[PDB]
Enzyme design. Structure first.
Site, PDB file in Angstrom:
ATOM      1  N   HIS A  14      -4.330  44.626   2.169  1.00 46.81           N
ATOM      2  CA  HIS A  14      -5.767  44.645   1.703  1.00 46.81           C
ATOM      3  C   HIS A  14      -5.676  45.548   0.691  1.00 46.81           C
ATOM      4  O   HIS A  14      -6.422  45.761  -0.013  1.00 46.81           O
ATOM      5  CB  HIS A  14      -6.572  44.940   3.034  1.00 46.81           C
ATOM      6  CG  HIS A  14      -6.656  43.730   4.014  1.00 46.81           C
ATOM      7  ND1 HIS A  14      -7.819  43.315   4.167  1.00 46.81           N
ATOM      8  CD2 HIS A  14      -6.037  43.130   4.540  1.00 46.81           C
ATOM      9  CE1 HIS A  14      -8.119  42.530   4.919  1.00 46.81           C
ATOM     10  NE2 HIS A  14      -6.646  42.268   5.180  1.00 46.81           N
ATOM     11  N   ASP A 115     -14.000  45.796   2.461  1.00 48.87           N
ATOM     12  CA  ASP A 115     -13.264  44.760   3.192  1.00 48.87           C
ATOM     13  C   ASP A 115     -14.088  43.769   4.199  1.00 48.87           C
ATOM     14  O   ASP A 115     -15.010  44.131   4.858  1.00 48.87           O
ATOM     15  CB  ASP A 115     -12.062  45.630   4.121  1.00 48.87           C
ATOM     16  CG  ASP A 115     -10.984  44.867   4.390  1.00 48.87           C
ATOM     17  OD1 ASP A 115     -11.043  44.177   5.406  1.00 48.87           O
ATOM     18  OD2 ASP A 115      -9.985  45.073   3.720  1.00 48.87           O
ATOM     19  N   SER A 343       1.845  37.555  -0.414  1.00 47.98           N
ATOM     20  CA  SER A 343       3.305  36.818  -0.775  1.00 47.98           C
ATOM     21  C   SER A 343       2.975  35.078  -1.119  1.00 47.98           C
ATOM     22  O   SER A 343       3.989  34.814  -2.045  1.00 47.98           O
ATOM     23  CB  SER A 343       4.318  36.946   0.048  1.00 47.98           C
ATOM     24  OG  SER A 343       3.742  36.901   1.251  1.00 47.98           O
TER      25      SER A 343
HETATM   26  O1  LIG Z   1      10.309  44.211   0.619  1.00 45.07           O
HETATM   27  C1  LIG Z   1       9.154  44.201   0.135  1.00 45.07           C
HETATM   28  C2  LIG Z   1       8.039  43.563   1.050  1.00 45.07           C
HETATM   29  C3  LIG Z   1       6.950  43.341   0.614  1.00 45.07           C
HETATM   30  N1  LIG Z   1       6.458  43.503  -0.773  1.00 45.07           N
HETATM   31  C4  LIG Z   1       5.058  43.179  -1.256  1.00 45.07           C
HETATM   32  O2  LIG Z   1       4.246  43.205  -0.428  1.00 45.07           O
HETATM   33  C5  LIG Z   1       3.381  41.882  -0.582  1.00 45.07           C
HETATM   34  C6  LIG Z   1       3.494  41.229   0.627  1.00 45.07           C
HETATM   35  O3  LIG Z   1       2.328  40.174   0.713  1.00 45.07           O
HETATM   36  P1  LIG Z   1       1.867  39.860   2.189  1.00 45.07           P
HETATM   37  O4  LIG Z   1       0.585  38.809   2.182  1.00 45.07           O
HETATM   38  O5  LIG Z   1       2.882  39.162   3.234  1.00 45.07           O
HETATM   39  O6  LIG Z   1       1.195  41.155   2.988  1.00 45.07           O
HETATM   40  P2  LIG Z   1       1.044  41.542   4.516  1.00 45.07           P
HETATM   41  O7  LIG Z   1       0.338  42.933   4.750  1.00 45.07           O
HETATM   42  O8  LIG Z   1       1.956  41.578   5.347  1.00 45.07           O
HETATM   43  O9  LIG Z   1      -0.374  40.398   5.100  1.00 45.07           O
HETATM   44  C7  LIG Z   1      -1.243  40.839   5.879  1.00 45.07           C
HETATM   45  O10 LIG Z   1      -2.464  40.707   4.509  1.00 45.07           O
HETATM   46  C8  LIG Z   1      -2.588  39.506   4.076  1.00 45.07           C
HETATM   47  C9  LIG Z   1      -3.885  39.738   2.871  1.00 45.07           C
HETATM   48  O11 LIG Z   1      -4.896  39.133   3.638  1.00 45.07           O
HETATM   49  C10 LIG Z   1      -2.849  38.463   4.839  1.00 45.07           C
HETATM   50  O12 LIG Z   1      -3.232  37.256   4.172  1.00 45.07           O
HETATM   51  C11 LIG Z   1      -1.902  38.430   6.007  1.00 45.07           C
HETATM   52  O13 LIG Z   1      -2.170  37.341   7.307  1.00 45.07           O
HETATM   53  C12 LIG Z   1      -1.656  39.696   6.682  1.00 45.07           C
HETATM   54  F1  LIG Z   1      -0.597  39.636   7.734  1.00 45.07           F
HETATM   55  C13 LIG Z   1       3.675  41.267  -1.483  1.00 45.07           C
HETATM   56  O14 LIG Z   1       2.729  41.640  -2.550  1.00 45.07           O
HETATM   57  C14 LIG Z   1       5.113  41.607  -2.114  1.00 45.07           C
HETATM   58  O15 LIG Z   1       5.068  41.852  -3.324  1.00 45.07           O
HETATM   59  C15 LIG Z   1       7.388  43.800  -1.792  1.00 45.07           C
HETATM   60  O16 LIG Z   1       7.284  44.115  -2.795  1.00 45.07           O
HETATM   61  N2  LIG Z   1       8.769  44.038  -1.149  1.00 45.07           N
END
Ligand SMILES: O=c1ccn([C@@H]2O[C@H](COP(=O)(O)OP(=O)(O)O[C@H]3O[C@H](CO)[C@@H](O)[C@H](O)[C@H]3F)[C@@H](O)[C@H]2O)c(=O)[nH]1
Ligand SMILES: [K+]
Length: 452
Positions: A14, A115, A343
């Site tokens: 977030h 948020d 992602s």
């Molecule tokens: O080794 C790495 C690891 C990650 N990243 C970066 O971190 C981001 C990962 O995206 P992601 O949606 O999976 O974040 P996450 O906090 O796990 O998801 C929650 O937040 C999301 C947003 O609401 C939600 O949808 C979800 O259910 C939640 F679990 C993504 O922008 C990548 O570029 C990186 O650059 N190198």
């Protein structure tokens, strides 16, 4: 000068999109302030230095970790491991109300983007006649699917865990099972989590509107469904990461186009050794070249001699990978992901198909969007909603190998790469002048300038 305050919850998924929204408002000559906490401020300060770019101000609130019984160092959702810490974490973020109302009276901004986990931020902003916008950080489809499941409860007309039910009202037939929903909603219902979801979904109607990190062309049936059938006022301004624009890269330069699989499970990657082991065994059997991202804290999860056995074909990244630069490389043609929206959007923005591995949150709804509607994905077989992972629930090597082959050489794999390539173009089209997301970002700002 217009002033907008951004109040994300302390979760990486977030905080990063909220920063990109703040940068977007800053580019339109709007003063943008982000509220964070001391142990999280480094995340923003680092990411602000990426110029001659407008300045984004930070305001630090005290997180009452001791008042709720959390370790002093637990100011982020990714340290609140287990059910007990997470409920303590949401009691803690709730106690930020006083600092928020004090800051709102002090600065009197024109708008509060807060948020989804702060439903009370609508009332707090009303005390000073400030409109409040909600930000979830997910797709329209997840927004709609969460609300239809909450209202109609199709999971009560089922008798067994894997029995499928359709999602009501949807313009697509989406089949789901109770096992993909949190046990807190269908098994032993606990009023704590249910009342939090009720207040979150209600805030989308009680507030001024919703900012959505999507673009209209990506999921138009659900950008409309959210507005018309569900009655929300909303603006799609995503992908917000776009308009703000290494050894593994040198490794890929010499590789064939669309022949390497990229594997990374986000920032909330709680991966146990027995699960990493099955992934390693499955990668070997696939024969595919790959870039695999694992976390830190060695033979307790790797097959003996693994790294050396796959040196010319496979690479293991243990640090923080340059995910955007890797996916948009020509050699990367597949992405094993947990279907977090940030992602998933990056996979779409790079035009890369995905193997979907949902774990918790709204990821199972995002998997349906990717596989059944967008048809740029392949399920891995994971279908059990769970915050942590039990060794009983580990996804075995055989399921992972079939998904690795299906996404690379399986049926329609060349069409999925083609469909992802258009979504890529539409994503860049949506954010440029005249695009869908560029347009009603201007429409939101103009509406904010004239709020009475
Ligand atoms: O080794 C790495 C690891 C990650 N990243 C970066 O971190 C981001 C990962 O995206 P992601 O949606 O999976 O974040 P996450 O906090 O796990 O998801 C929650 O937040 C999301 C947003 O609401 C939600 O949808 C979800 O259910 C939640 F679990 C993504 O922008 C990548 O570029 C990186 O650059 N190198
Ligand atoms: K309605």
């Amino acid at each position: 000068q217009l002033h907008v305050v951004f109040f994300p919850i302390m979760a990486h998924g977030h905080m990063i999109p909220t920063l990109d929204i703040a940068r977007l408002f800053a580019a339109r000559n709007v003063r943008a302030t982000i509220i964070t906490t001391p142990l999280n401020a480094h995340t923003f300060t680092k990411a602000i230095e990426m110029n001659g770019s407008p300045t984004i101000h930070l305001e630090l609130f005290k997180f009452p970790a001791q008042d709720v019984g959390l370790p002093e160092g637990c100011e982020n959702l990714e340290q609140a491991l287990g059910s007990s810490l997470i409920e303590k974490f949401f009691k803690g973020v709730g106690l930020l109300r006083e600092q928020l109302e004090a800051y709102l009276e002090k600065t009197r901004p024109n708008c509060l983007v807060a948020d989804m986990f702060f439903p009370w931020a609508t009332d707090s902003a009303a005390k000073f006649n400030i409109p409040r916008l909600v930000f979830h950080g997910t797709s329209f489809f997840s927004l709609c699917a969460l609300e239809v499941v909450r209202l109609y409860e199709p999971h009560k007309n089922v008798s067994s865990d894997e029995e499928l039910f359709s999602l009501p009202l949807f313009p697509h037939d989406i089949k789901m099972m109770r096992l993909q929903l949190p046990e807190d909603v269908w098994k032993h219902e606990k009023a704590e989590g249910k009342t939090r979801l009720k207040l979150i979904k209600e805030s989308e109607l009680k507030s001024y509107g919703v900012i959505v990190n999507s673009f209209y062309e990506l999921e138009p049936n659900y950008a409309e469904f959210f507005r018309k059938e569900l009655g929300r006022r909303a603006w799609n301004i995503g992908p917000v990461s776009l308009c703000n624009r290494h050894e593994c890269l040198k490794w890929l330069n010499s590789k064939k186009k669309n022949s390497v699989i990229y594997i990374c499970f986000g920032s909330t990657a709680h991966q146990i050794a027995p699960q990493l082991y099955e992934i390693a065994m499955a990668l070997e059997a696939s024969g595919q070249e790959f870039i695999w991202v694992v976390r830190n804290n060695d033979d307790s999860w790797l097959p003996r001699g693994f790294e050396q056995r796959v040196e010319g074909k496979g690479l293991i990244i243990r640090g923080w990978a340059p995910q955007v630069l890797i996916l948009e490389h020509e050699a990367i043609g597949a992405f094993v992901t947990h279907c977090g929206w940030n992602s998933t959007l990056e996979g779409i923005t790079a035009g890369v198909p995905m193997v979907t591995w949902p774990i918790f949150a709204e990821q199972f709804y995002n998997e349906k969007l990717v596989n059944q509607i967008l048809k740029i994905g392949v399920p891995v077989g994971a279908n059990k909603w769970s915050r942590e992972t039990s060794i009983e629930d580990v996804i075995k090597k055989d399921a992972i190998e079939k998904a690795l082959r299906e996404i690379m050489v399986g049926d329609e794999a060349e069409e999925r790469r083609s469909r992802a390539k258009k979504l890529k173009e539409m994503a860049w089209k949506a954010v440029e002048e005249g695009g869908s997301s560029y347009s009603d970002l201007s429409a939101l700002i103009e509406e904010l300038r004239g709020y009475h």
